[PDB]
């Protein structure tokens, strides 16, 4: 298992533009197009993303290409954050995948809301950090997914995924 397989499981694969749990236009493997409530805006974003005129439908290879870009983007962002970088560098590979999962799904800003949790892990306060992470909008909105990610971060294993 790896970050790719992990997110593929959590994010699923859609080849046509759809509105997510929050109502925002998305496509492929969890690729947020826009927060605009306007579908054509969303189509415009999609064409820009893929580099051709698509009318809301892409191929799986296109989808995977956007996903790799998105995964890269996520790590790049953790590594560029002054506070996250050392946190990530200090983690083992499974736990680093957990963090990548979180970044990818919610973005930098929201991710910063979890700093207390992260310090708690730095300090080997693993269960405490886990219970703490469940106290959040994230968990409240997509509990099964968050539970998997939390378990992953807490244990360093891929148990929640097999
Ligand atoms: Cl893009």
From Swiss-Prot:
Gene3D superfamilies: 1.10.530.40. It is found in: Host cytoplasm. Changing residue 11 to N: Loss of 84% of enzymatic activity. The keyword Secreted does not apply. Changing residue 132 to I: 5-fold decrease in enzymatic activity. GO terms for molecular function: lysozyme activity. Substrate binds at residues 32, 104, 117, 132. Changing residue 117 to V: 50-fold decrease in enzymatic activity. Optimum pH is 7.3. Pfam families: Phage_lysozyme. GO terms for cellular component: host cell cytoplasm. Changing residue 117 to I: 500-fold decrease in enzymatic activity. It is an enzyme of class 3 (hydrolase). Induction: Expressed late in the viral replication. Its EC number is 3.2.1.17. The active site is at 11 (proton donor/acceptor), 20 (proton donor/acceptor). It catalyses: Hydrolysis of (1->4)-beta-linkages between N-acetylmuramic acid and N-acetyl-D-glucosamine residues in a peptidoglycan and between N-acetyl-D-glucosamine residues in chitodextrins. CDD domains: T4-like_lys. Keywords: Antimicrobial, Bacteriolytic enzyme, Cytolysis, Glycosidase, Host cell lysis by virus, Host cytoplasm, Hydrolase, Viral release from host cell. PANTHER family: T4-TYPE LYSOZYME 1-RELATED (PTHR37406:SF1). HAMAP family: ENDOLYSIN_T4 (MF_04110). Endolysin with lysozyme activity that degrades host peptidoglycans and participates with the holin and spanin proteins in the sequential events which lead to the programmed host cell lysis releasing the mature viral particles. Once the holin has permeabilized the host cell membrane, the endolysin can reach the periplasm and break down the peptidoglycan layer. Belongs to the glycosyl hydrolase 24 family. This is Endolysin. It comes from Enterobacteria phage T4 (Bacteriophage T4).
């Amino acid at each position: 298992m790896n970050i790719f397989e992990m997110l593929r499981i959590d994010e699923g694969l859609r080849l046509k533009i759809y509105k997510d749990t929050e109502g925002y236009y998305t496509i492929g493997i969890g690729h947020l197009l826009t927060k605009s409530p306007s579908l054509n805006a969303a189509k415009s974003e999609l064409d820009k993303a893929i580099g051709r005129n698509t009318n809301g439908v892409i191929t799986k290879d296109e989808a995977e290409k956007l996903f790799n870009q998105d995964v890269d983007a996520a790590v790049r962002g953790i590594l560029r954050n002054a506070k996250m970088k050392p946190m990530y560098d200090s983690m083992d590979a499974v736990r680093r995948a957990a963090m990548m999962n979180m970044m990818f799904q919610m973005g930098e800003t929201r991710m910063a809301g979890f700093t207390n949790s992260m310090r708690m892990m730095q300090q080997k306060r693993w269960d405490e950090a886990a219970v703490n992470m469940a106290k959040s909008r994230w968990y409240n909105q997509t509990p099964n997914r968050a539970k998997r990610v939390i378990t992953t971060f807490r244990t360093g294993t891929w148990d929640a995924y097999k």
